[PDB]
Amino acid sequence: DHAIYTAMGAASQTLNQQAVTASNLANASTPGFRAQLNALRAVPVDGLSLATRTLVTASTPGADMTPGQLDYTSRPLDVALQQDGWLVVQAADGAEGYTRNGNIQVGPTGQLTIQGHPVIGEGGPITVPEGSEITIAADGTISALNPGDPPNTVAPVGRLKLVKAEGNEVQRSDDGLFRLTAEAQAERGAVLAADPSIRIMSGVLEGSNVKPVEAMTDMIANARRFEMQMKVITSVDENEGRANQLLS
Amino acid sequence: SSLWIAKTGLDAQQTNMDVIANNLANVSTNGFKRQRAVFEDLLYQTIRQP
Amino acid sequence: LLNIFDIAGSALAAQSKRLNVAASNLANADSVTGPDGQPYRAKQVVFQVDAAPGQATGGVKVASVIESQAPEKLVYEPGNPLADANGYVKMPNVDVVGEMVNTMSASRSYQANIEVLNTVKSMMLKTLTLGQ
Amino acid sequence: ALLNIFDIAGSALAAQSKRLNVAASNLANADSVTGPDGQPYRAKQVVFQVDAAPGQATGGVKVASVIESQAPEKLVYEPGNPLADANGYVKMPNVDVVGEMVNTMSASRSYQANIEVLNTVKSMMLKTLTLGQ
Amino acid sequence: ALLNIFDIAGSALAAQSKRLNVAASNLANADSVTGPDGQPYRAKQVVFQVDAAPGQATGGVKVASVIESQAPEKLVYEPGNPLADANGYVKMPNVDVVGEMVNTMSASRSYQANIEVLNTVKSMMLKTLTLGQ
Amino acid sequence: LNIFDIAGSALAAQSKRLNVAASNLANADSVTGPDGQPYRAKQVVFQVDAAPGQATGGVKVASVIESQAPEKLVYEPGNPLADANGYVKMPNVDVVGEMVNTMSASRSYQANIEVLNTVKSMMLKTLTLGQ
Amino acid sequence: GGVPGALSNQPAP
Amino acid sequence: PGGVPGALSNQPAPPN
Amino acid sequence: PGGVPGALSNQPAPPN
Amino acid sequence: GVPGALSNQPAPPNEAPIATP
Amino acid sequence: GVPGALSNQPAPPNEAPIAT
Amino acid sequence: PGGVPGALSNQPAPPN
Amino acid sequence: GVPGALSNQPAPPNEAPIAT
């Protein structure tokens, strides 16, 4: 009578896994995206006699840090980081966040943004002089040349804050930015200092890293697992009916 | 459910398709700047904390 | 309590336990970890005759639930935290076809035992009106 | 004391009927967006307690109260619908359809079991009334 | 009149039927240039509300009204059309194709789920009446 | 007991509509009948059959009519059936309409079948009354 | 009480 | 006085 | 102490 | 009022013109 | 204890945690 | 006595 | 009379000729 609940848990968590996979597939064109991993954990129920009931719980263990494919766009402000490297932005709630989106934009007032989040430099958020032409070097250095002026007068303005962090040290926040895990925060500090060993390419944008093969295989597996759980539910549903209706 | 998630995905690619069609229709226009569409994922839902 | 009733009830319990084990195994065909971080090893029940005071014939009791000894499947995911020095993650050895067939056979045995119990109860109800 | 089975099984039948009704109400409003007050529909669930007054050993079952289910509200990006959020996040109910279907099936089965209990109890009461005759 | 479960599930069926009808009408008029008079067709939307009910905890779904979507009407440059404005842009409806197919699928699956709920409840309904006899 | 007559009339009417739809589909490409006239598409007429005075009742097929819709003209002057301008009258059968009619008639047929089954069960159970 | 049963008449009549 | 069912009565035609 | 019957109390709950 | 209620009046005929009269 | 037997002491509350 | 019922026993196994 | 009524006289035979 309670195997129906085990099968129902399996089917519901299969639905959750399918939702995760569909959300990953919907962002196949999102610039600088990290796919969410999915794994079904097994929770064994601990009673006294025979733990013959073990349930299923869907989980998302971090994300995927494999870089995607770089689109070469003839623009100086689109940048791509090294493998396992992160650009730093000031988060929505006045905090710090890390990202791979190298689509740096400028405003009328001259401040750099990523998705609307101001970028964080050595001295705080980076502000470029109003209406200047901007070039980004291979180590984060930013040069600004005023329009209609000799290129000789170009001068550096600041340096981007580029950090290095692996998947174990990084957890996705609800606003799409990545942050440090508590266990990583305890060791590497609240704020990560700039890592000078990371090279950055200017003029190339990093796309998403969702793998179509894994997504399609996961969808097929989810469908089949759901059908099996429905069969288990149906088998349990007939037996209980007969039993009660007759042994009364 | 997943249906709307995938429907939002389909709507984004159609948008991108419309952007590409607009860019390709204005090939011979004088002084045209190409349009590039970027996408962002909406709010992540936390169900149970680690 | 009553013998045949005891037999049928014990057998219903045993077949329900087997069905629950099979359902839990089918749920965990693709599970990669548990709470401790160990792989999920498929469970299988052990049936034994419950005829302790009833000579060699009696009900069936589930002696134990044991992890199957079939070798664990191995998947090459070197980035997985659970991967060993060789990069192989252990995944359960649950056979889907076997579990489906186990569920079906357990259901059929459950129904047969219920019919047996109903017939026996009807026979005693008629025995209650002997000589009248 | 076979008469108390009437009360026990009747309370159980009423509680299971209420649970089935709540589950069906949740299921029928999985696609709702608005309530009578404009609030999003919140999935609701009954609470089962032992219907035992202080000092009573074992009783039937009773519905204590109906509570809002604890689950994140399903966010949908539709900033064209007249109902929306600051960022266009329409809030939809957190109904888990599989859970509601399984709940409906379980409530129906428990209901039928209680009906069988009531039937056999009434048969026994009639017998007992035919004790010596 | 109706039993509470009957009313809830029947209201769910009627609401899903209305949503499916709106989706079908939108899909039919995807290429319409002019309506009954001369104004462009506007994509219709159906808004689900929960029947407040005295119980509140249990309630079906009602549809207050069919609203007309407020989205930028599609503009197609056809100056020769009599319905072109001063600038010459004829107005085509804002009916999106993918959204309507998704709506049709979702309405069908909610309809079938409510049908299954009614089918499940029925057997218990018919078996209740054997309690007295 | 009148429900048997009502539902049987409904089943007969839906069978007639289905047969008319099948006839329309069969001869969508037909050229001539036994005489020299083309195949005019058929449609049944549904009416409310209330032999007594109580307003409502079952459905009855009053008649089978030939749609007055215009006849398709194809230019075939070598055909002896062509008129002075060399046109031949081909039927105006709406293919999609007739397929939809087939499916809708099938569904209404099943609904009436289910009604008949349910009421037959109820009328069988009413004979048990108090015994 | 606050919740009417599933097998009750339309609380909403 | 109901008319033709199905296709003919479900097509937009001008009144006469 | 009872609790919520069915789906909520038969799905793996959060740790705390 | 509500769709599915009971009234003592037949509904008006369902006309759908193609052009404005 | 043998399952299905009778004991005067109640079974301990069972739990199924996700992480140890 | 007895062993694992169902799938595991009614499957060919290496001799041991 | 009515398509499904009862009459005492047999229905006339029905034949389908290719041409009239």
mmCIF file of N, CA and C in Angstrom, chain F residues 29-33 36-40 70-76 81-83 86-92:
data_model
loop_
_atom_site.group_PDB
_atom_site.id
_atom_site.type_symbol
_atom_site.label_atom_id
_atom_site.label_comp_id
_atom_site.label_asym_id
_atom_site.label_seq_id
_atom_site.Cartn_x
_atom_site.Cartn_y
_atom_site.Cartn_z
ATOM 1 N N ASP F 29 -14.332 12.694 -56.046
ATOM 2 C CA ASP F 29 -13.770 12.800 -57.386
ATOM 3 C C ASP F 29 -14.691 12.226 -58.455
ATOM 4 N N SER F 30 -15.942 11.924 -58.113
ATOM 5 C CA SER F 30 -16.861 11.327 -59.071
ATOM 6 C C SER F 30 -17.250 12.334 -60.147
ATOM 7 N N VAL F 31 -17.500 11.830 -61.349
ATOM 8 C CA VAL F 31 -17.807 12.665 -62.505
ATOM 9 C C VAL F 31 -19.294 12.652 -62.828
ATOM 10 N N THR F 32 -19.894 11.466 -62.909
ATOM 11 C CA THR F 32 -21.282 11.346 -63.328
ATOM 12 C C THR F 32 -21.965 10.254 -62.517
ATOM 13 N N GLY F 33 -23.290 10.350 -62.438
ATOM 14 C CA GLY F 33 -24.090 9.324 -61.818
ATOM 15 C C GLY F 33 -24.621 8.354 -62.849
ATOM 16 N N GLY F 36 -26.808 11.639 -66.574
ATOM 17 C CA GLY F 36 -25.751 12.571 -66.917
ATOM 18 C C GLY F 36 -25.552 13.685 -65.911
ATOM 19 N N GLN F 37 -26.137 13.548 -64.729
ATOM 20 C CA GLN F 37 -25.991 14.649 -63.790
ATOM 21 C C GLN F 37 -24.841 14.388 -62.821
ATOM 22 N N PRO F 38 -24.197 15.434 -62.313
ATOM 23 C CA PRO F 38 -23.080 15.239 -61.387
ATOM 24 C C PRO F 38 -23.571 14.787 -60.018
ATOM 25 N N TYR F 39 -22.610 14.527 -59.141
ATOM 26 C CA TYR F 39 -22.900 14.087 -57.780
ATOM 27 C C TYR F 39 -23.016 15.308 -56.878
ATOM 28 N N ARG F 40 -24.236 15.630 -56.462
ATOM 29 C CA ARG F 40 -24.452 16.703 -55.506
ATOM 30 C C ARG F 40 -24.277 16.169 -54.091
ATOM 31 N N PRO F 70 -22.451 25.838 -54.979
ATOM 32 C CA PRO F 70 -22.187 25.836 -56.422
ATOM 33 C C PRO F 70 -21.364 24.620 -56.875
ATOM 34 N N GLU F 71 -21.522 24.208 -58.136
ATOM 35 C CA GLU F 71 -20.801 23.028 -58.592
ATOM 36 C C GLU F 71 -19.436 23.436 -59.125
ATOM 37 N N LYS F 72 -18.410 22.668 -58.775
ATOM 38 C CA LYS F 72 -17.080 22.964 -59.283
ATOM 39 C C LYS F 72 -17.063 22.755 -60.787
ATOM 40 N N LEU F 73 -16.379 23.633 -61.506
ATOM 41 C CA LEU F 73 -16.293 23.536 -62.956
ATOM 42 C C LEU F 73 -14.855 23.250 -63.355
ATOM 43 N N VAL F 74 -14.657 22.197 -64.143
ATOM 44 C CA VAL F 74 -13.341 21.868 -64.678
ATOM 45 C C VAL F 74 -13.398 21.933 -66.195
ATOM 46 N N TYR F 75 -12.356 22.496 -66.798
ATOM 47 C CA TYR F 75 -12.327 22.681 -68.245
ATOM 48 C C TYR F 75 -11.908 21.375 -68.908
ATOM 49 N N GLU F 76 -12.881 20.648 -69.450
ATOM 50 C CA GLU F 76 -12.625 19.403 -70.170
ATOM 51 C C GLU F 76 -13.560 19.361 -71.370
ATOM 52 N N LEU F 81 -19.700 15.023 -71.531
ATOM 53 C CA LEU F 81 -20.535 15.627 -70.500
ATOM 54 C C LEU F 81 -20.390 17.141 -70.425
ATOM 55 N N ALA F 82 -19.420 17.719 -71.126
ATOM 56 C CA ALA F 82 -19.172 19.150 -71.030
ATOM 57 C C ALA F 82 -20.310 19.950 -71.651
ATOM 58 N N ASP F 83 -20.526 21.151 -71.118
ATOM 59 C CA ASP F 83 -21.575 22.039 -71.603
ATOM 60 C C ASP F 83 -21.049 22.853 -72.785
ATOM 61 N N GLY F 86 -17.532 23.927 -72.566
ATOM 62 C CA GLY F 86 -16.543 22.894 -72.339
ATOM 63 C C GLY F 86 -16.237 22.607 -70.891
ATOM 64 N N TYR F 87 -17.117 22.989 -69.971
ATOM 65 C CA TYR F 87 -16.916 22.754 -68.551
ATOM 66 C C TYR F 87 -17.703 21.536 -68.089
ATOM 67 N N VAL F 88 -17.156 20.850 -67.092
ATOM 68 C CA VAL F 88 -17.766 19.668 -66.498
ATOM 69 C C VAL F 88 -17.988 19.956 -65.021
ATOM 70 N N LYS F 89 -19.159 19.565 -64.518
ATOM 71 C CA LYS F 89 -19.546 19.809 -63.134
ATOM 72 C C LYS F 89 -19.014 18.683 -62.257
ATOM 73 N N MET F 90 -18.072 19.011 -61.389
ATOM 74 C CA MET F 90 -17.510 18.142 -60.375
ATOM 75 C C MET F 90 -18.042 18.532 -58.997
ATOM 76 N N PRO F 91 -18.190 17.565 -58.091
ATOM 77 C CA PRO F 91 -18.886 17.836 -56.830
ATOM 78 C C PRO F 91 -18.125 18.798 -55.932
ATOM 79 N N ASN F 92 -18.877 19.441 -55.037
ATOM 80 C CA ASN F 92 -18.362 20.459 -54.132
ATOM 81 C C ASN F 92 -18.095 19.908 -52.735
#
